[PDB]
C-alpha cells in the first residue's frame, strides 16, 4: 500500500538534520491550520480507503498510467542516446499537476473544508485545482500574476469555465512568487474554512512531503515501464525544476538505484550572467523563503531577486527543500537551460515526434539532448514530459515566425 518513509523529513519537516532544509517559516497565525493539514495528511496517507479513492480517480478520471514513449527520432540529436518520454502531457488537464491536486482535494474534502485556494504560474496547477473543485463541489479561488494571465491566457479562460474565480496579482514581479504571496494572504484571513492547495514541492511542512508523495506515482510507473521496454534500469532520469514537484515525483522511485543518474534542469532565461534567469541552484544561495529553508535567488541583504523565464511554470526564484537536500547530498545534479535552448527543443519535439510540449518540459528535453551527447550511444535516458503546450501555442508560434 503506502511506500516507505526512508527519505522523509522529521516531524518538524527538516531534511538532513533537525535544523536542515525545510521546516516551517510561517507566522503563528497559520500554525493551527498547518498542524491540522499535517494531522489530516498523516491520518489519510496510511488509510487504504483514502488511497483507494485516489487510485480510482487516477485510473478512470485522470487516465493513469501515463505511457512511456521512446522518442527514436530524437536519438541523433542526443549523441545517439535513447530518449524515453514519460507522457504526463496526456494526463487529464494536460500536466502532472493533476496528480497532486487529486490527492489534496480529496484531503480538503476529508477535512470538511468548503473553500479551496491556490496559486498558479503556468495555469496548469490552477486549471487542475479548478478541475477537482468542480468535481468535488468545492468553491475555488486561483491567484495568478498579471504577467502570467497574459502569456497563459488559455488557462485563465479554462479556469473560469470550470467555475473558479481567477484573481490577477499585480504586486512584485507579477508572476509565480507573487501569486504565492497573495494566496498566503488569503489563507491567514480564511484559515477556518479554506484549504490551501499548493502546487509544487515547496512551502512549509507538510507540503514538500505531501506533494512529493502524490507525485511519486510518476516514478513508480516509469521504473516499471523502462525495465520492460529497455530491459534494464535507465542511465539517467531527467526533469525540469521549478518548485520541484514533477522532478521529485519521477526521481523518487530511483533514489536507491545507485547507478541511475538524476539530473534536474532549471530555467536560465536570457542567461545566468544576465540577471534575467530563474537558475535557483546555479546562481542562488541558502535562505528562508516561502515557508521553507532552501535555495533562492537573493541579494546581499537577503531580499528576493525577481526571476525571469520564457516559461511561466519555471519563472520562480526558489526551489523545494528536498531538492536542496538531494543536491547537498550529491544524489541529484541541477543544471541551467536557457530560453533559446528550450525553444529549440520545443520545436524539435514538434517536428520530430509530433508532440507539442509545455515550454517547461522543453527545458527537460533540451537538457536530455545535451546529456545524451555526454553519455553517448546506447544510453537510456528517461525524460519527464511534464505537460503539453496548448497553453504555449501562441508564444511558440510567435517565436518561430508562424503568426507574423
Amino acid at each position: 500500500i503506502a511506500e516507505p518513509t526512508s527519505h522523509d523529513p522529521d516531524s518538524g519537516g527538516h531534511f538532513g538534520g533537525p535544523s536542515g532544509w525545510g521546516g516551517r517559516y510561517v507566522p503563528e497565525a497559520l500554525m493551527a491550520v498547518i498542524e491540522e493539514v499535517t494531522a489530516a495528511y498523516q491520518k489519510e496517507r496510511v488509510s487504504q480507503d483514502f488511497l483507494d479513492d485516489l487510485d480510482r480517480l487516477q485510473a478512470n478520471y485522470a487516465g493513469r498510467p501515463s505511457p512511456l514513449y521512446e522518442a527514436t527520432r530524437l536519438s541523433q540529436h542526443a549523441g545517439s542516446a535513447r530518449i524515453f518520454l514519460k507522457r504526463e502531457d496526456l494526463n487529464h488537464t494536460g500536466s502532472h499537476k493533476i496528480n497532486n491536486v487529486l490527492g489534496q482535494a480529496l484531503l480538503a474534502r476529508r477535512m470538511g473544508k468548503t473553500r479551496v485556494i491556490a496559486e498558479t504560474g503556468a495555469g496548469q496547477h490552477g486549471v487542475a485545482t479548478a478541475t477537482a473543485c468542480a468535481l468535488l463541489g468545492l468553491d475555488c479561488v486561483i491567484y495568478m500574476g498579471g504577467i502570467d494571465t497574459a502569456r497563459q491566457a488559455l488557462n485563465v479562460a479554462r479556469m473560469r469555465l470550470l467555475g473558479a474565480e481567477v484573481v490577477a496579482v499585480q504586486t512584485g514581479s507579477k508572476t509565480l512568487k507573487d501569486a504565492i504571496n497573495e494566496a498566503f494572504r488569503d489563507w491567514v484571513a480564511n484559515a477556518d474554512n479554506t484549504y490551501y492547495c499548493f502546487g509544487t514541492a515547496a512551502g512549509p511542512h507538510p507540503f514538500p512531503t505531501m506533494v512529493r508523495d502524490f507525485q511519486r506515482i510518476i516514478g513508480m510507473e516509469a521504473r516499471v515501464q523502462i525495465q520492460g521496454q529497455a530491459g534494464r534500469l535507465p542511465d539517467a532520469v531527467v526533469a525540469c525544476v521549478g518548485g520541484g514537484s514533477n522532478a521529485i515525483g519521477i526521481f523518487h522511485a530511483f533514489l536507491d538505484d545507485p547507478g541511475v543518474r538524476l539530473v534536474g534542469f532549471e530555467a536560465a532565461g536570457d542567461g545566468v550572467e544576465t540577471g534575467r534567469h530563474a537558475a535557483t541552484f546555479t546562481a542562488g544561495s541558502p535562505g528562508a523563503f516561502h515557508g521553507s529553508f532552501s535555495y533562492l535567488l537573493q541579494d546581499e541583504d537577503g531580499q528576493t531577486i525577481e526571476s525571469h523565464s520564457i516559461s511561466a511554470g519555471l519563472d520562480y526564484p526558489g526551489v523545494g527543500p528536498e531538492h536542496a537536500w538531494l543536491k547537498e547530498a550529491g544524489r541529484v545534479d541541477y543544471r541551467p537551460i536557457t530560453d533559446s535552448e528550450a525553444m529549440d527543443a520545443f520545436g524539435l519535439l514538434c517536428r520530430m515526434e509530433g508532440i507539442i510540449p509545455a515550454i517547461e518540459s522543453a527545458h527537460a528535453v533540451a537538457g536530455a539532448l545535451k546529456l545524451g551527447v555526454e553519455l553517448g550511444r546506447g544510453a537510456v535516458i528517461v525524460v519527464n514530459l511534464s505537460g503539453r503546450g496548448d497553453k504555449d501555442v501562441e508564444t511558440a508560434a510567435k517565436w518561430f515566425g508562424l503568426l507574423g
Binding site: 503563528e28 500554525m31 541583504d301
Partner: protein, 249 residues
Amino acid sequence: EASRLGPVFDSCRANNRAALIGYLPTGYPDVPASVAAMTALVESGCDIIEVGVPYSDPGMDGPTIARATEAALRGGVRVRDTLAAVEAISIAGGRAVVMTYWNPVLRYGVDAFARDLAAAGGLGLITPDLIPDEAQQWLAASEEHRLDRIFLVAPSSTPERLAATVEASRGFVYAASSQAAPELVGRVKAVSDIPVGVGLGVRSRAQAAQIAQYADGVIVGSALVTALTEGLPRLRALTGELAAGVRLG
C-alpha cells in the same frame, strides 16, 4: 535577570497607562526622512519604537506598510540603515526594537545581527515569520547579546502553542489580530505575567484607550505610516493623541 523592556512596562503600569509602541519602516520616504520621523516618535511620547526592516515579499503586511516598504526598497534601503536608525533612536533617548522578516537576519548572520543590534543600542527583535520551533539559533543569540525576543500569538493559537510561544518570549508577547483581542490577552495572562502588546489597526485615541484597558502595550503601525505620508506634523499630532489614549489616570 529582567528583560531589556521590563523597566518600560513597569514604569507604565505604575503610571496607570499602557506603553505606546510605534512602528515605522526604515527608508520611507527615504533614509534621512525616516530617521527624522522615528526621532519625532521619541519626541512625541512613543515609549518603544519598532524599527521595521523592509522586505521584498512582506506577506503579513497590509497595503499601507507594503507600499511604503516597496518605495523604501526602490530608494535603496539597506539592512544596515536599520542599525543606524536604532543608533539614532538610542541617541535621542528612545528605546528601539527591530521588527523584521527572518531571511534578512539569516543572510546577515543570526549571531552577527544580534551582536550589531545590541551594539547599536537595540533592546529586542520582533520576528513575525519566525516561530519558536525554528528559533534555536535566535534563542542562543538572544541570550548571548541580551536582546528581548518578541514572538507573535494569534486568536487561532492552540493552547499548547500559545503556552510554548509565551514561554519563548522575552520583553512582551505580540498579540496580533471584535472580541478576539481581549480574549487573546486573557489566554496569555492565564499562563504568564509577561507584558502583552496588542496590534489592532489602531488609528485613533479612542481605540488606543480601549486597548489600554486590558493590554500592557498598544501597538500602532499602519496609522503612523499614513500620518507620515501626509507629513511630519501630522505624525506628531497623531502620536500625541495616541499617547493620551494609552493613559487612564
